[PDB]
Design a protein around this ligand. Structure first.
Ligand SMILES: [Mg+2]
Lengths: 97, 135, 79, 254, 237, 169, 190, 67
RNA sequence: GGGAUGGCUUGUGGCGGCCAAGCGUUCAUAGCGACGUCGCUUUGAUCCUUCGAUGUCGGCUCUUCCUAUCAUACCGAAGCAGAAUUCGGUAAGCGUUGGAUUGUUCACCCACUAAUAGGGAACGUGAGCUGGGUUUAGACCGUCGUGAGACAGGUUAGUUUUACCCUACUGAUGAACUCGUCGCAAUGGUAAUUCAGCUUAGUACGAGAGGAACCGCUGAUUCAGAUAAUUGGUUUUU
RNA sequence: CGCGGGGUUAAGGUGCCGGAGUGGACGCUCAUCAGACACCACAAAAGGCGUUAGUACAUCUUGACAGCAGGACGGUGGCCAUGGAAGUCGGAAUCCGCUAAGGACUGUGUAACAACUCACCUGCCGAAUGUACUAGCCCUGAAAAUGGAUGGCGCUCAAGCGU
């Protein structure tokens, strides 16, 4: 018989399986769609998470209650030493991807 | 229009259904017993709860006998559970207290004892007009 | 209806033995009951059924009517 | 306020279709002969009770929405009698309340019988009997429902006349300029034409004098014959003149 | 706005500029639309649509036949009875229903179980059909009540039709004369199909040949009250 | 076992079971008129009578009131009163002269103000507690009607401190 | 029943050139070129006579015979388009808020664009792109009138229908709110 | 042909004439021939012809057929 | 020792009379008969008429499915002015709550809310936990019985106690292809939701009372995935 | 019905799974889950502007059916009623003239009129039509709840249906 009181299911099935990731370094599944009329640029970078701290921001958000006021916000610091470019990979399009 | 006011930032809700808080006005009531919170959503087993600036529905347990037989709208003006404002300040009052209003936000009483919160004062102009101290 | 994009549960055309046997039994019982009702039918029935006649679009219908006249005249003359 | 919040009154056949489609669609329909007899009884008892509850809600809405003539100011009571016959008004609402009560009695009787029914076939027959008797009772209400729906539309379009405020009542014979005066001093859209009885209902406009709101009532014309020979159109003006404490402006064309 | 304001708006400003064209085109598409409904609607909605279309076709045929025939009371009553709603009014002493379905004791009576043990006593019987208990009825004490005739199934009146006068009146039941299945059913007063009951016919105004008023007669039950929730009977005249 | 349910042909089915004479009816009507009520007498066995031919008829005011609505509808149907095919032109009035209309409006206003004052003399409220519904349960009233059906004598018990308060009319 | 032979004919004016190859019909006139692919319909084309196109179906059912009437009218409409043209006049009306209609020609795409503003006081700007080959002009003879003209009747009438459907009143009584843009005249340019 | 235009049965008083009108016209003309000295033919091409009523009224001794 | 009705059902009563297109019948003019109709089953009342457990349901947690749609989205119609709605269509994507009441068929009340829709997967017997139908042995009262005892009944207290197996499910390793780095993507899963406020605008509309919407802007509800700067909590940092 | 070899069949089959025909003849059918082992129920004298084959009655070069151009009139604003009411809110009557034909009116419309429209008639046109039934095949003719079944693939001048 039917469930007497409705409730949404616990957790999202979109993030299955809840297994360990196959690699320590994160994988860019998708890069931005390429427009050849734009100038050449890089789409990504790497860094190392160092920790978190607090800032005070002078907010300019018209319509918001905190407009023209100071807001305290949490931030994350990522240590980013420069990357070194060492290679070039070419990709072709096939009916298998 | 229902009792829930718009433009209210998220805060820690300190008063669930069943809480008894002080009455900060001179309407004759001494305390207010929360039976419902305006604008509360739907979730299984979750008690509805309100914070400072929220309109609740309350009954009077101590006070004048004429106020005992009705369900009054009330606005929470002070809470003891600590909450954070957008300037990073965590703060709390030394009691939980509210004032009886009508659905339009106008007060039943004519004076407020003690301070009121900035949230309640900003959301309800009659409370702001009847407050002596705003903290 | 949104049948093409979201079809429902299909209606099976595969029969079960139980339903086939039950349908056969009900059909046989209906045949017996209809025979009994025809045997006890009180509705009036004609001794001779009404003939449709000759179709109008038959091109030699008038010739057939002439032959019918000639046959009945010959029969009356012989009798 | 007015009478625009009266819900629409369906015809008898529409009422039957609405109630039976609610019963068909808002309740489960599949019950099996092999189930327990208490389960079968519960199924058919719920069908009968839900049908009666829908009928009661709709009839009660009709009764509670229409005005009570006995509770009105004498102007509105007399005007309502002029526009719709007061006997017919009370008779139609009385038939509605009587049908509502009879439908509840039928529901109680058949629920009591379904407590003792012993098979799915008997339960089904008793359910169908209850629903059919309710439908027969509703089908007997064909003329009152049509009349009440017409009355509802006219009541929704009636002007709001406050009987205890500052009011100017414009009266007189036809074709003397009553609607012309009302158009010249207010914003009301009461038509002006050269033929008699251009205005066939009361119209109201409003004005401000010394920061005070006044209401002005344009009326149909009145002819010179006694009250027994007056039709409903002239009797609207007679009702306004008799029951509204106002300043009367009697217009004459010399 | 007040009074007939949409009619006045139509008088002053007209309608939308494409209104007549759109109405004419929709009325022209009604034939295809009705065929599409006839072939594509499903279920109960389809059944109600087909039944209601059947009713339209019959009414249209009647109107057409009457228009073709444009170019072409029953019993004598006095003048004071003219224009009133009058009834149409249409040895072997056999009843109209000489035979009905027999009711077994298993169908008539259900076992009422008593006791607190898992195995229960079963001597009490409840009557599952409508009954007539007669006047001044007091139920037996529960320790000595074998036959239970529940109050919700007790009836006092019946809708009796007179075959000759063609009228139906609600009449009090006087007694149960003969239930055809069992004399025990007669004694319990069970009202099923084919049962002979005695009814009060005072409302019918029957006078005998000697001038006495006949207020008690016999009727036969013509329906199944356990299925209908009412008692229907025909007077035996 | 299914029995044979058959009604035999019989002349008794087509005769009158109970007849009464006009003199007997008149005597019973006189008994109706002279009947008086005594608390110290009880009814032991009712006499089977055609009481609709014996009891006094309804009062004429109720008899005319009970048919006034159907009379008004038969005289003036709903579709002729209001609606697109309505033919009603003359209203029904409680007055005949302008002077009577003035007096009628005065009395109507007085009665309207009196009813308003009576209603005035006579935040939403909290719900009535369910404890004050005790004694009105369907189970309790089923028990009561079972006891009434089973009992010959009914002892209605009254608190002496409040007899009419505890009386169950 | 299958009909052995069925035939329709299309007359062609003197200034028109018609070329049909594998049921792809090209019609040439003073006003330009129109093309239409009719390979979804079984038909045999021929030149029966000087200035007359013949259309025929062999061994066809009643439906296939009937389809030639549609083919005939379609080709006749292309011929009328390259000779006289097609013109749809639309009128926009309002009660309180004046409808503002602005017409531009996109140089990149070649299509006309119609921007509609202040439709019952709404703040959104409605934008309709015309079909290629349809010209839109604001009239100077009459008040609040647009004129859509072209060679393709389908392109002109569909552009007019898109303008008609973009200005739809929603959630209001349409006996009362009469604002909109409506097709008021249909005809030929010449 | 299941797909067909539904024919409107008219609930109006006047029916189609038929061959009875043709025979009545024949008999009326052939009965008016021997009573008159002259038979003119007149034409009214692309005209409203509601003024033939007034012509018939004016020429009350003559007989006009417009069939 | 033996056991543990089902391509059912759904929305429109029964009996009696009449009419009836048609079906039959036309050496008998009977009989069947849809659509209908007519009889039985308070001037908006009364509140001083609640009519029998042999049949048992629940609650918690949690998942999924149906659509017979309560809300949210789009659409058709209505004196639908506006506002608020009502009737209907497509639609199950997404939600569908918190309490009171056991001197009882626990069903109805109260409130919040966008809304507080209805069902199945058990109840066509049936090992998750735990309350009622419910019922071993102790005991009391009522009814019956001479009694043992039984029951119209009412009350109180009361023993079942796996998992380490196979499968399923959730995670975790892994042989063979030298080891490793960077990738591709078949297939499977899939995600957001609702409300309010500002502006539009006291504008369209309206006699008046009242009173919207599109574009634009800002928060909040429910859900989901992370995180620990800050604030609380936690302390064997013993 | 013993154990074997060869030959031939029955019921059922021959597009693939599967041995044997994408076999032959003439037709019918297009289904938003067709149909293929149906007869019973749903279910009716049922609903279809699906598609064919028929039966009956009827119109038609004296011009049918569809249209387009025009007529659609006079007694008369017929009687009663209505504040008003003229074919068109109602009640009841519903005739005559001129006629080629035209209702004491079929709808829209007006406060009432007006104006428009339909019935009916004429001109143009040009050859076949209309209506009601009958028989086939097709669609609808009620369905719940894990994902599934003409046995599966799949099949559309069939690999469906009749011979
Ligand atoms: Mg005037």
């Amino acid at each position: 018989s039917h469930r007497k009181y409705e409730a949404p299911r616990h957790g999202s099935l979109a993030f299955l399986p809840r297994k360990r990731a196959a690699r320590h370094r994160g994988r860019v599944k998708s890069f931005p769609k390429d427009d050849p009329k734009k100038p050449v640029h890089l789409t990504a970078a790497m860094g190392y998470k160092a920790g978190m701290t607090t800032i005070v921001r002078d907010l300019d958000r018209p319509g918001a209650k905190a407009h023209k006021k100071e807001v305290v916000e949490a931030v994350t610091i990522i240590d980013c030493p420069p990357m070194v470019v060492v290679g070039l990979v070419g990709y072709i399009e096939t009916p298998r991807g | 229009k229902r009792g829930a006011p718009g433009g209210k930032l998220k805060m820690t809700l300190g008063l669930p259904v069943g809480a008894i808080m002080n009455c900060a006005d001179n309407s004759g009531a001494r305390n207010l017993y929360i039976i419902a919170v305006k604008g509360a959503g739907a979730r299984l087993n979750r008690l509805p709860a309100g914070g400072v600036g929220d309109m609740v529905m309350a009954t009077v347990k101590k006070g004048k006998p004429e106020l005992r037989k009705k369900v009054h709208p009330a606005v929470i003006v002070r809470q003891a559970k600590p909450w954070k404002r957008f300037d990073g300040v965590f703060l709390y009052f030394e009691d939980n207290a509210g004032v009886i209003v009508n659905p339009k936000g106008e007060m039943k009483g004519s004076a407020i004892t003690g301070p009121v919160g900035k949230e309640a004062a900003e959301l309800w102009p009659r409370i702001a007009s009847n407050a002596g101290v705003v903290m | 209806a949104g049948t093409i994009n979201k079809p429902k549960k299909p209606t099976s055309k595969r029969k079960t033995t139980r339903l086939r046997a039950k349908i056969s039994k009900r059909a046989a019982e209906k045949k017996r009951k209809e025979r009994k009702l025809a045997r006890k039918n009180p509705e009036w029935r004609s001794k001779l059924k009404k003939d449709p006649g000759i179709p109008n679009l038959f091109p030699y219908k008038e010739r057939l009517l002439q032959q019918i006249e000639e046959e009945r005249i010959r029969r009356k003359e012989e009798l | 306020t007015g009478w625009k919040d009266i819900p629409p009154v369906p015809t008898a056949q529409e009422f039957i279709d609405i109630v039976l489609s609610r019963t068909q669609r808002r309740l489960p329909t599949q019950i099996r002969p092999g189930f327990k007899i208490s389960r079968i009884r519960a199924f058919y008892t719920r069908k009968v009770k839900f049908t009666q509850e829908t009928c009661s809600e709709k009839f009660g809405a009709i009764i509670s929405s229409f005005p009570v003539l006995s509770d009105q100011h004498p102007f509105h009571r007399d005007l309502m009698n002029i526009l719709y016959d007061a006997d017919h008004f009370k008779v139609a609402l009385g038939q509605i309340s009587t049908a509502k009560n009879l439908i509840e009695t039928i529901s109680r009787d058949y629920v009591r019988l379904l407590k003792y029914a012993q098979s799915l076939y008997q339960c089904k027959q008793l359910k169908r009997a209850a629903l059919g008797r309710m439908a027969t009772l509703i089908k007997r209400l064909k003329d009152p429902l049509i009349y009440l729906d017409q009355v509802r539309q006219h009541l929704a379009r009636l002007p709001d006349i406050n009987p205890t405020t500052r009011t100017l009542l414009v009266a007189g014979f036809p074709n003397v300029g009553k609607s012309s005066f009302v158009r010249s001093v207010t914003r009301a859209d009461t038509p002006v034409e050269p033929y008699a009885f251009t205005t066939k209902s009361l119209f109201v406009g409003h004005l401000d004098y010394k920061y005070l709101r006044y209401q002005v009532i344009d009326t149909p014309g009145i002819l010179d014959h006694p009250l027994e020979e007056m039709n409903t159109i002239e009797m609207q003006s007679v009702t306004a003149l008799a029951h509204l404490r106002a300043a009367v402006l009697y217009f004459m064309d010399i | 706005p007040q009074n007939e304001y949409i009619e006045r708006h139509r008088k002053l400003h007209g309608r939308r500029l494409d209104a007549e064209e759109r109405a004419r085109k929709k009325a022209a598409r009604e034939g295809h639309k009705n065929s599409e409904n006839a072939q594509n609607l499903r279920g109960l909605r389809a059944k109600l649509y087909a039944k209601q279309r059947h009713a339209q076709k019959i009414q249209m045929r009647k109107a057409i036949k009457q228009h073709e025939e444009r170019n072409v009371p029953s019993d004598p009553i006095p003048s004071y009875l003219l224009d009133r709603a009058n009834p149409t009014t249409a040895a072997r002493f056999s009843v109209p229903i000489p035979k009905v379905r027999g009711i077994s004791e298993e169908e008539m009576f259900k076992v009422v179980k008593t006791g607190k043990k898992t195995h229960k006593k079963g001597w009490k019987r409840i009557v599952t059909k409508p009954t007539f208990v007669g006047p001044d009825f007091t139920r037996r004490p529960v320790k000595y009540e074998r036959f239970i005739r529940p109050m919700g199934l007790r009836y006092k009146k019946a809708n009796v039709t007179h075959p000759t006068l063609n009228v139906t009146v609600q009449l009090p039941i006087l007694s149960v004369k003969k239930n055809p299945s069992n004399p025990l059913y007669t004694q319990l007063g069970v009202l099923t199909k084919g049962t002979i009951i005695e009814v009060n016919v005072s409302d019918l105004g029957i006078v005998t040949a000697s001038g006495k008023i006949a207020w008690g007669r016999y009727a036969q039950i013509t329906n199944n009250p356990e299925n209908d929730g009412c008692v229907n009977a025909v007077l035996l005249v | 076992e299914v029995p044979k349910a058959v009604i035999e042909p019989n002349r008794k089915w087509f005769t009158n079971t109970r007849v009464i004479s006009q003199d007997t009816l008149q005597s019973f009507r006189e008994a109706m008129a002279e009947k008086q009520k005594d608390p110290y007498t009880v009814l032991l066995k009712s006499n089977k009578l055609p009481m609709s031919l014996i009891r006094d008829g309804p009062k004429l005011e109720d008899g005319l009131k009970k048919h006034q609505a159907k009379m008004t509808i038969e005289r003036e149907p709903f579709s002729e009163t209001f609606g697109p095919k309505a033919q009603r032109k003359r209203p029904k009035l409680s007055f005949n002269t302008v002077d009577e209309l003035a007096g009628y409006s005065e009395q109507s206003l007085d009665s309207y103000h009196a009813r308003l004052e009576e209603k005035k003399l006579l935040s939403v409220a909290t719900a009535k507690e369910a404890i004050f519904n005790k004694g009105t349960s369907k189970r309790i009233w089923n028990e009561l009607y079972k006891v009434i059906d089973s009992s010959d004598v009914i002892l209605h018990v009254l608190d002496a401190r409040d007899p009419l308060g505890t009386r169950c009319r | 029943m299958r009909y052995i032979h069925s035939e329709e004919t299309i007359p062609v004016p003197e200034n028109v050139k018609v070329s049909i190859k594998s049921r792809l019909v090209t019609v040439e006139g003073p006003r330009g070129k129109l093309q239409k692919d009719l390979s979804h319909i079984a038909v045999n084309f021929s030149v029966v006579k000087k200035g007359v196109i013949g259309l025929e179906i062999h061994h066809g059912s009643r439906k296939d015979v009937a389809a030639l009437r549609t083919v005939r009218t379609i080709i006749n409409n292309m011929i009328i388009g390259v000779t006289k043209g097609f013109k749809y006049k639309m009128r926009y009306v309002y009660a309180h808020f004046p409808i503002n209609v602005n017409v531009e020609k996109n140089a990149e795409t070649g299509c006309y664009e119609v921007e509609i503003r202040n439709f019952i006081g709404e703040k959104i700007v409605r934008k309709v792109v015309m079909a290629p080959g349809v010209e839109v002009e604001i009239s100077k003879a009459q008040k609040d009138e647009l004129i859509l003209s072209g060679n393709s009747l389908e392109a002109v009438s569909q552009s007019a229908a898109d303008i008609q459907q973009i200005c739809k009143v929603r959630n209001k009584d349409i006996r009362k709110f009469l604002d909109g843009i409506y097709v008021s005249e249909k005809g030929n340019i010449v | 042909p299941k797909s067909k235009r539904a024919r409107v049965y008219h609930l109006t008083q006047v029916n189609k004439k038929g061959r009875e009108a043709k025979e009545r016209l024949f008999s009326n003309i052939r009965e008016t021939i021997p009573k008159y000295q002259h038979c003119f033919v007149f034409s009214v091409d692309n005209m409203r012809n509601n003024y033939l009523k007034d012509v018939r009224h004016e020429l009350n001794d003559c007989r006009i057929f417009f069939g």
